[PDB]
């Protein structure tokens, strides 16, 4: 049985990592009903968008949502993890970020307080994540210049 959207937000990181598809779905099934415009097709043409800037304003909100999706898919793309929800990398874990052991992290902490504890070094980790790939780019570069 599945706890529902964001159900494991108070669960251990391992339990939420088991239901990450659940959190992944609310990125799409909020935006499937709005792009549908099936219940919007007939109601006063296109919900009277003439002299109603809330209609455009509403539309701009829909744009922000798909724009955020594109930000996350871009990050998964430049880290070579586009197709997968869980991917391992080559970046070693610098201990200065967090000193907690594996058992304490995955069976004693929630993703919220973890993201709060590591929000300080997120940019650095992303930099290593954008950098580390670059050594794969370079190995492919060796295969390119023969």
């Amino acid at each position, epitope marked *: 049985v599945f706890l529902g959207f964001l159900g494991a937000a108070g669960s*251990t990181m*391992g339990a939420a990592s088991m239901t990450l598809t659940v959190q992944a779905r609310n990125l799409l099934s909020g935006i499937v009903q709005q792009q549908s415009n099936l219940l919007r097709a007939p109601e006063c043409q296109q919900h009277l968008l003439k002299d109603t800037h809330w209609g455009i304003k509403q539309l701009q909100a829909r744009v922000l949502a798909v724009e955020h999706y594109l930000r996350d898919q871009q990050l998964l793309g430049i880290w070579g993890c586009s197709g997968k929800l869980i991917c391992c990398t080559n970046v070693p874990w610098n201990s200065s970020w967090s000193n907690r052991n594996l058992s304490e992290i995955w*069976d*004693n902490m*929630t993703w919220l*307080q973890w993201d709060k504890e590591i929000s300080n070094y997120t940019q650095i980790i992303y930099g290593l994540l954008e950098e580390s790939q670059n050594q794969q780019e370079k190995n492919e570069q060796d295969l390119l210049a023969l």
Partner: nanobody
Amino acid sequence: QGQLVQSGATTTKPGSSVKISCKTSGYRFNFYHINWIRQTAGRGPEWMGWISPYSGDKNLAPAFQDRVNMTTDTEVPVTSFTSTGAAYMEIRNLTSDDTGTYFCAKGLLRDGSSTWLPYLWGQGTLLT
């Protein structure tokens, strides 16, 4: 980061019932279990039981199975990841051999095999 405060000590003659209060802070009271353990003077200290503040499920040693009643007060929220609560411990029949030091402790991890294992202890109390 958490703290476990324990009630004041008191000496009562055998035959009557008593109550120990263990007040919590500095963590999420519903996250970690609550254990009660006694240090016997003259023999080896013995674990007594544990209870979940959230699930409410309780499991005691057979040495105190039908002689102990545990209760957990509903946690009081403090921070986004810190709450405060109260844990209560009870004994039905008192005797002279019940004399010894008592402690309340919290759990180490939230899941896994070492879930209810005592980690952070209280200052302790003395008896008759």
